UniProtKB/Swiss-Prot annotation:
There is a cross-link at residue 123 (Glycyl lysine isopeptide (Lys-Gly) (interchain with G-Cter in UFM1)). This is Ubiquitin-fold modifier-conjugating enzyme 1. E2-like enzyme which specifically catalyzes the second step in ufmylation. Accepts the ubiquitin-like modifier UFM1 from the E1 enzyme UBA5 and forms an intermediate with UFM1 via a thioester linkage. Ufmylation is involved in various processes, such as ribosome recycling, response to DNA damage, interferon response or reticulophagy (also called ER-phagy). It comes from Homo sapiens (Human). Belongs to the ubiquitin-conjugating enzyme family. UFC1 subfamily. The lineage of its organism: Eukaryota, Metazoa, Chordata, Craniata, Vertebrata.
Length: 166
């Protein structure tokens, strides 16, 4: 399949996750979070080595609320957007919903409340990989491809404009 090769090309060097545990699962959730933090940190390090350091994320103490920033470069200008998501009770079988609040109401490819609207292809891809995919994969396979279509389109339509900051 083209899809399977496309998936491997993106995620092959991202540490695979193992533990089937959600926010309520106590010592199993603590284990899942270690796998989540190890997968994220390697993804970030690979991203830096490829001049594509495109996001920062932190979580609350319990790892149920995640927030940070993503950066997107167009015609050599860097656009920064605040991002956030909750971990569903049913995670990791259920995929998180990434929100980019500042873009709420600015694109059709987004639900109310700033939750980004993915293609019908991400959700079944997540489902057939459960529980191996985690937050690094959500960024690599969800938000990354979203920004790569929506940010260029909103700049073109003059809805997004660049911060003239030094």
């Amino acid at each position: 399949s083209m899809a399977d090769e496309a998936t491997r090309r993106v995620v092959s060097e991202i540490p695979v996750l193992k533990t089937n545990a959600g926010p309520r699962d106590r010592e199993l959730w603590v284990q899942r979070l270690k796998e989540e933090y190890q997968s994220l940190i390697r993804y970030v390090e690979n991203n830096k080595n490829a001049d594509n350091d495109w996001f920062r994320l932190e979580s609350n103490k319990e790892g149920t609320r995640w927030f940070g920033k993503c950066w997107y470069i167009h015609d050599l200008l860097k656009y920064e957007f605040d991002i956030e998501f909750d971990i569903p009770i049913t995670y990791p079988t259920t995929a998180p919903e990434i929100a980019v609040p500042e873009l709420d109401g600015k694109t059709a490819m987004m639900y109310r409340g700033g939750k980004i609207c993915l293609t019908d292809h991400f959700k079944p891809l997540w489902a057939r990989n459960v529980p191996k995919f985690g937050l690094a994969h959500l960024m690599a396979l969800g938000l990354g491809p979203w920004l790569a279509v929506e940010i260029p389109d909103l700049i073109q339509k003059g809805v997004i404009h660049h911060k003239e900051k030094c």
